[PDB]
């Protein structure tokens, strides 16, 4: 743990717009055992409302975050909900402030579940990929950080037990569900091998060779936060999984599916997860 936190009289959660004096953290958050997150405030809120319906809470699902917060925060029974924007650095802001919240509240062994969207590798659009490993662009199982100007690597650890549980649950439940490797990229375009960005320094042939070699090593999708979430949670004593839908066969680059078809796909991770939460005391 970070003993420097003892130096504070009050901790300001800058991006959630509240402080440790805003509530009794033990009282308000102490019962939390799950944290559902995704890059969209709308989507994660939508998932929270669905979970409140499943659990029988009728009162609206309201934002806990303060006025000028960057992130939203919801609570349904023993489940916390938050967004985290796009990319590893945004996700780390969420991760730091949420895990401090959990610690202050005395929450232990919490499960973080990322309900994201991604680009697939050799799988049809609509496919849910349960990550068996989050890996960087060089296919290395680490989150890279540069702390105080010095390079740090942090091993990526997926909750394989929960992942296998999810796979088994999926076998008993409108799409394909695949366990495979997941690429985490700091770019939506060039580093993910897209030819249709504003800047491109490689040919199609060079793109494909990069993608197949990734595929051959078992990669099934590509997104932008995985290495951050599955490395951080483990390091802070919690568990994490990625359950991501794919929006394209990286056959091409463009996301050509309609907005509504996309909305449909992006809810598929929530569908599987909601049942898993339902069967494992996420809700009363």
Ligand X SMILES: O=c1cc[nH]c(=O)[nH]1
* Number of helices and strands in the chain (H, E): 7, 13
Beta bridge partners of 129: 178, 244
Binding residue (CB under 8 A) for a copy of itself from 14, 28, 53, 167: 14
Task: Tell me how far, at minimum, the Cβ of 8 lies from a copy of itself, in Å.
Answer: 6
CB nearer to a copy of itself: pick between 145 and 169? 145
Task: Tell me how far, at minimum, the Cβ of 22 lies from a copy of itself, in Å.
Answer: 12
Task: Tell me how far, at minimum, the Cβ of 56 lies from ligand X, in Å.
Answer: 34
208-227 binders of ligand X (CB under 6 A): 222-224
**Interface with ligand X includes 266 (CB under 6 A)?**
no
Question: Which of a copy of itself, ligand X, none sits in contact with 27, Cβ below 5 to 8 A by type?
Answer: none
Question: Which residues are annotated as part of the binding site?
Answer: 39, 70, 114-119, 192-194
Question: Which of ligand X, a copy of itself, none sits in contact with 118, Cβ below 5 to 8 A by type?
Answer: ligand X
Binding residue (CB under 8 A) for a copy of itself from 85, 165, 218, 249: 85
Q: How far apart are CA 48 and CA 117, in angstroms?
A: 17
Task: Tell me how far, at minimum, the Cβ of 172 lies from a copy of itself, in Å.
Answer: 31
88-127 binders of ligand X (CB under 6 A): 117-119
Q: Which stretch binds a copy of itself (CB under 8 A): 48-56, 57-65, 107-115, 189-197?
A: 189-197
Q: How many residues bind a copy of itself (CB under 8 A)?
A: 73
Contacts for 12 with CB less than 8 Å, ≥ 6 apart: 19
Q: How far apart are CA 66 and CA 17, in angstroms?
A: 4
Asked if residue 156 lies in contact with residue 114, where contact means CB atoms within 8 angstroms, the answer is no
DSSP secondary structure of 70-122: SS-EEEETTEEEEE--SSHHHHHHHHHHHHHHHHHTT--SPEEEE--EEEESS
Q: How many residues bind ligand X (CB under 6 A)?
A: 11
Task: Tell me how far, at minimum, the Cβ of 49 lies from a copy of itself, in Å.
Answer: 17
210-229 binders of a copy of itself (CB under 8 A): 210, 213, 224
Q: Residues 132-171 vs a copy of itself: string with x where CB under 8 A?
A: ----xxxx-----xxxxx--x-------------------
Burial category of 41 from C-beta neighbours within 10 Å (exposed 0-12, middle 13-18, buried 19 and up): buried
173-202 binders of ligand X (CB under 6 A): 185, 188, 192
Neighbouring C-beta atoms of residue 138, cutoff 10 Å: 7
Asked if residue 115 lies in contact with residue 270, where contact means CB atoms within 8 angstroms, the answer is yes
Please name which of 266, 263, 251, 224 lies closest in space to residue 84, comparing C-alpha atoms: 224
Give, as one character, the DSSP assignment of residue 187.
-
DSSP secondary structure of 71-85: S-EEEETTEEEEE--
Q: How far apart are CA 145 and CA 222, in angstroms?
A: 19
**Interface with ligand X includes 132 (CB under 6 A)?**
no
Q: Which residues bind ligand X (CB under 6 A)?
A: 117-119, 185, 188, 192, 222-224, 247-248
């Amino acid at each position: 743990v970070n003993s420097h936190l003892s130096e504070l009289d009050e901790d300001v959660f800058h991006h959630f717009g509240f402080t440790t004096k805003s509530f009794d953290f033990k009282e308000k958050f102490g019962d939390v055992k799950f944290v559902c997150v995704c890059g969209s405030s709308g989507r994660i809120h939508n998932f929270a409302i669905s979970m409140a319906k499943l659990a029988g809470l009728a009162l609206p699902v309201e934002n806990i975050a303060g006025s000028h917060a960057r992130f939203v925060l919801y609570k349904v029974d023993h489940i916390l909900f938050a967004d985290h924007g796009m990319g590893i650095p945004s996700a780390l802001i969420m991760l730091h402030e949420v895990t401090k919240l959990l610690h202050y509240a005395g929450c232990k062994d919490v499960l973080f579940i990322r309900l994201g969207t991604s680009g697939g590798l050799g799988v049809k659009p609509g496919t849910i990929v349960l990550s068996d490993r989050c890996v960087n662009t060089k296919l290395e199982p680490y989150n890279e950080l540069c702390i105080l100007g010095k390079p740090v690597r942090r091993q990526t650890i997926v909750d394989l037990n929960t992942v296998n549980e999810l796979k088994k649950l999926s076998e008993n439940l409108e799409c394909s569900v695949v366990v495979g490797g997941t690429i985490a990229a700091n770019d939506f375009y060039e580093e993910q091998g897209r030819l249709d960005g504003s800047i491109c320094t490689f040919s199609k042939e060079e793109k494909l060779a990069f993608l197949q070699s990734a595929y051959e090593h078992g990669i099934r999708n590509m997104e932008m936060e995985g290495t951050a979430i599955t490395s951080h949670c483990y390091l802070t004593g919690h568990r994490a999984i990625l359950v991501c839908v794919t929006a394209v066969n990286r056959e091409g680059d463009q996301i050509t599916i309609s907005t509504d078809e996309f909305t449909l796909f992006a809810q598929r991770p929530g569908q599987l997860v909601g049942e898993y939460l339902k069967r494992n005391n996420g809700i009363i």
